[PDB]
């Protein structure tokens, strides 16, 4: 269960090795990159366990920016910082990553 940087959805590490991030893999390509990228985009340290089942009208979803993202476990805080390449690609594609650790 490594907390994703961008969307925050968390799934068992096997899930990301094999099933991936439901929303960020399109731009983060965790399924199709070295495990270094998967771990950097999905850290094993996280805080603020938020279970989301309905996100379309949940205020928690609007605050957490997961109203569009698939309902599921989400982590409020993720420590560390993204390396240069991941954030550079995110900003090139127009995804201004907002760290959720504050």
Partner 1 sequence: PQRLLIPTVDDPGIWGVKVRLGKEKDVVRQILKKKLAREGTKNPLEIYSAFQRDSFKGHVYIEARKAEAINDALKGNVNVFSNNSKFLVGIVEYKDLLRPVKLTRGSYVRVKNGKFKGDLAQVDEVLENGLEARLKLVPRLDYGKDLSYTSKFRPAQRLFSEAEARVHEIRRDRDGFVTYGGEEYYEGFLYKTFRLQNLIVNSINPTLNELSLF
Task: List binding-site positions.
Answer: 4, 7, 21, 24
Q: Does 4 bind Zn ion (CB under 5 A)?
A: yes
Contact of 77 with 5, CB cutoff 8 Å: no
Q: Does 21 bind Zn ion (CB under 5 A)?
A: yes
Size of residue set near Zn ion by CB under 5 A = 5
Q: Does 11 bind Zn ion (CB under 5 A)?
A: no
- Cα 32 from Cα 75, distance rounded (Å): 23
For residue 6 the two structure tokens come to 């961008």
Tell me the CA end-to-end span of the chain in Å, nearest whole number: 21
Round the CA-based radius of gyration of the chain to a whole number and report it.
12
Nearer to partner 1, 31 or 81 (CB): 81
For residue 75 the two structure tokens come to 């982590």
Interface ranges with partner 1 (CB under 8 A): 39-40, 47-55, 57-64, 71-73, 76-77, 79-81, 83, 100-102
Chain residues in the site for Zn ion (CB under 5 A): 4, 6-7, 21, 24
């Amino acid at each position: 269960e490594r907390a994703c940087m961008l969307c925050g959805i968390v799934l068992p590490g096997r899930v990301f090795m094999q099933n991936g991030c439901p929303n960020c893999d399109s731009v983060l390509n965790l399924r199709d990159s070295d495990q270094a990228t998967v771990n950097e985009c999905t850290s094993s340290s996280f805080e603020g366990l938020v279970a989301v089942g309905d996100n379309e009208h949940s205020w928690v979803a609007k605050w957490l920016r997961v109203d569009r993202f698939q309902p599921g476990l989400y982590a409020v805080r993720v420590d560390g910082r993204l390396p240069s390449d991941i954030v550079a690609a995110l900003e090139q594609y127009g995804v201004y990553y907002r760290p959720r650790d504050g």
